[PDB]
């Protein structure tokens, strides 16, 4: 907390609105599954694109001309 006579602000690494500290930890735990799913999807999309590129480059190479 930092307070000024005309300005009030508090800096928080995490915040919510239900005021139930159990709800805060519940949200923090639930965000972990979303984070893992997002990371996995981001990895798999890049892997699929890289496989397509690798196959195309292999076809180009085997077509040596």
């Amino acid at each position: 907390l930092e307070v000024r006579p005309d300005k009030v602000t508090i800096l928080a690494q995490a915040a919510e609105r239900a005021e139930d500290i159990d709800v805060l930890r519940a949200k923090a735990a639930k965000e972990r599954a979303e984070r893992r799913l997002q990371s996995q999807q981001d990895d798999i999309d890049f892997k699929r694109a890289e496989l397509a590129l690798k196959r195309a480059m292999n076809r180009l190479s085997v077509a040596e001309m």
Partner: protein, 283 residues
């Protein structure tokens, strides 16, 4: 060569060009999203920075352990690299700079420790058998504070325990879509602070040390998070530029292959018509 071989090569090059163009578009969208995410972080960073500036430099307060420049015997290194390739020289530049800096001024594995972010940096350091102590991999394309807070507080506590007296951050700084600059930053101890223009003083409900000992680690974590956001933006820009260059190279290759194909076609037609006419004349 044969006409059919040239045609097959042209088709393959066209396919590669299409794939690279699609990758470039995806990278552009991700770069825009990363820029939005980075700009979403400014209000917290500026406020915490000015609070640290006007608290740590007011009424002395230099006695805090993370403010004094204690003599160094072990040095930390925090390296931010990508988890995926196709970014051009994004990872190689920072890895080369880190390796050159380490070899120049340490010459001993006991004098330093390495904290690495990203698969490629971890593999690079493990190939040389250098002492990696902390690592995080498989970060999302748009990381939040939650998935970096653990490692940030771990490294802050590792410094606080006295394991190493100094550490630096190495990452790519996002200047523009074309320019990404490798940056070396001394994270802590905070040898200098950018004093704000307002310079107020606050009452401390705890003691001053009892406030600083909680405030400063948060400042270090915020700095680490900002560096990570900058690195992500630079990575997306670098991947976009690399894909654009690959598409241009493929287009040039197609341009030359077309001329070769035309020459082969003319030669084939000439040979066929000459053979037909010779066969006709033989009778």
């Amino acid at each position: 060569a044969s006409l059919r071989d040239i045609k097959t090569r042209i088709n393959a090059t066209k396919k590669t060009s299409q794939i690279t163009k699609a990758m470039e578009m995806v990278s552009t969208s991700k770069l825009n999203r990363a820029e939005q995410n980075a700009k979403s972080f400014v209000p917290y960073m500026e406020k915490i920075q000015e609070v640290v500036a006007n608290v740590a430099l007011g009424a002395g307060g230099a006695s805090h352990p993370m403010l004094v420049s204690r003599p160094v015997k072990k040095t930390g290194y925090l390296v931010i690299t990508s988890d995926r390739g196709l970014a051009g020289a994004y990872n190689s530049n920072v890895l080369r700079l880190v390796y050159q800096t380490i070899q120049k001024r340490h010459a001993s594995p006991d004098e330093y420790a390495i904290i690495v972010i990203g698969r490629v940096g971890l593999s690079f350091f493990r190939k040389r058998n250098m002492p990696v102590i902390l690592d995080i991999t498989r970060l999302p394309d748009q990381p939040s504070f939650a998935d970096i807070k653990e490692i940030a507080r771990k490294t802050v506590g590792l410094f606080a325990d006295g394991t190493f007296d100094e550490l630096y951050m190495y990452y790519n700084h996002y200047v523009s879509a074309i320019q990404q600059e490798v940056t070396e930053r001394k994270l802590l101890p905070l040898t200098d602070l950018a004093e704000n223009k307002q310079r107020t003083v606050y009452e401390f409900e705890p003691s001053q040390e009892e406030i600083l000992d909680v405030l400063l680690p948060q400042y270090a974590e915020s700095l680490i998070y900002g560096a990570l956001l900058d690195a992500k933006a630079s990575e997306h820009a670098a991947r976009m530029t690399a894909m654009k260059n690959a598409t241009d190279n493929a287009n040039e290759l197609i341009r030359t292959l077309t001329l070769s194909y035309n020459r082969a076609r003319q030669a084939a037609i000439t040979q066929e018509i000459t053979e037909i006419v010779a066969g006709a004349n033989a009778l």
